Amino acid sequence: PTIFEERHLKYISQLGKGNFGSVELCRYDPLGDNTGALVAVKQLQHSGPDQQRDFQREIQILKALHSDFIVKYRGVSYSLRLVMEYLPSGCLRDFLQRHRARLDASRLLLYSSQICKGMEYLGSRRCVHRDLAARNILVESEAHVKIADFGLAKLLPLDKDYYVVREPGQSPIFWYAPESLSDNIFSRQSDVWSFGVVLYELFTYCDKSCSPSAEFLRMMGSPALSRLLELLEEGQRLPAPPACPAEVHELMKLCWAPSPQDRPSFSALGPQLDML
Numbered sequence: 001p002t003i004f005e006e007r008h009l010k011y012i013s014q015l016g017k018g019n020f021g022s023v024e025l026c027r028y029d030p031l032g033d034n035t036g037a038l039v040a041v042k043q044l045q046h047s048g049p050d051q052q053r054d055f056q057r058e059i060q061i062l063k064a065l066h067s068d069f070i071v072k073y074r075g076v077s078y079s080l081r082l083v084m085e086y087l088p089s090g091c092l093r094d095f096l097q098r099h100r101a102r103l104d105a106s107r108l109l110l111y112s113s114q115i116c117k118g119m120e121y122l123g124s125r126r127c128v129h130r131d132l133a134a135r136n137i138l139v140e141s142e143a144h145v146k147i148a149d150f151g152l153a154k155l156l157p158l159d160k161d162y163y164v165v166r167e168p169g170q171s172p173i174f175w176y177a178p179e180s181l182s183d184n185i186f187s188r189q190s191d192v193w194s195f196g197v198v199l200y201e202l203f204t205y206c207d208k209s210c211s212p213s214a215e216f217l218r219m220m221g222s223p224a225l226s227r228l229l230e231l232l233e234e235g236q237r238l239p240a241p242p243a244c245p246a247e248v249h250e251l252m253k254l255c256w257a258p259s260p261q262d263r264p265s266f267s268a269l270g271p272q273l274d275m276l
């Protein structure tokens with residue numbers, strides 16, 4: 001099952017690109033009569049040595065994760081390719097923009113709860129995502145979302161609860177916490193910072209004009225990394241989204257606490273979301 005033969009993976013269409021590589025919709029059909037299962041196949045076409053090493057790490061991390069709110073690993077094909085389950089409604093960013101009129105606050109709260117449970121589990125496995133955002137969240141159906149794109153994901157060292165990355169910025173800066181911007185320090189607490197921005201994204205329906213980049217860029221005014229750092233250290237944050245519940249906005253601000261240890265854990269965030 002885990003060893004997918006390359007000749008049986010029949011290409012259908014393109015899906016998109018994560019942090020590195022690209023993903024394709026394929027039908028794995030060994031019987032050769034297109035009666036097989038649709039799957040999501042990731043590969044690296046135009047990639048350096050650094051991205052190849054990250055990909056080997058992504059495969060092993062995702063293979064080991066088992067949650068209802070984390071995209072399932074199916075197997076591998078060797079030209080190394082990662083086979084994942086296919087979620088036909090796509091990513092949440094586009095889903096919220098497309099179906100803005102139909103999706104009320106209670107539904108946004110359900111996605112927040114499911115993502116939080118996924119991240120709580122990811123914390124128990126001592127794994128840091130490093131790129132938690134609406135673009136990397138997939139949609140199974142109207143009542144079910146999963147976390148995806150584990151390319152930048154790291155396991156914490158056996159003796160520490162934080163990871164210092166040597167590389168600078170493989171993702172957009174507007175989801176990073178202060179200690180990641182200033183010192184490249186990543187942890188479960190920096191993932192909680194990013195969850196606050198995801199909460200902001202949900203409750204703006206990923207509207208482009210009031211996105212994290214759009215809002216912060218106006219504050220930064222006429223180095224982009226250093227200016228963002230200054231704003232965050234001075235106490236500047238994303239505003240309350242229009243028509244956002246007050247209780248949800250207070251949780252965002254707790255997720256954006258200056259010190260990592262003052263941010264709540266995903267285990268403490270879970271009940272607070274579910275009781276609204």
Ligand SMILES: CC(=O)N[C@@H]1CCc2ccc(Oc3cnc4[nH]cc(C(=O)N[C@@H](C)C5CC5)c4n3)cc21
Pocket residue numbers: 014015016017018019023040042071084085086087088089090091094135136137138148149
């Ligand atoms: C043709 C089209 O409408 N494409 C849109 C563009 C954006 C997007 C994303 C996912 C997506 O659908 C799916 C569906 N199942 C999937 N399984 C793994 C996926 C994945 O890794 N997607 C990345 C590109 C992604 C997690 C980082 C994955 N992506 C579809 C689209």
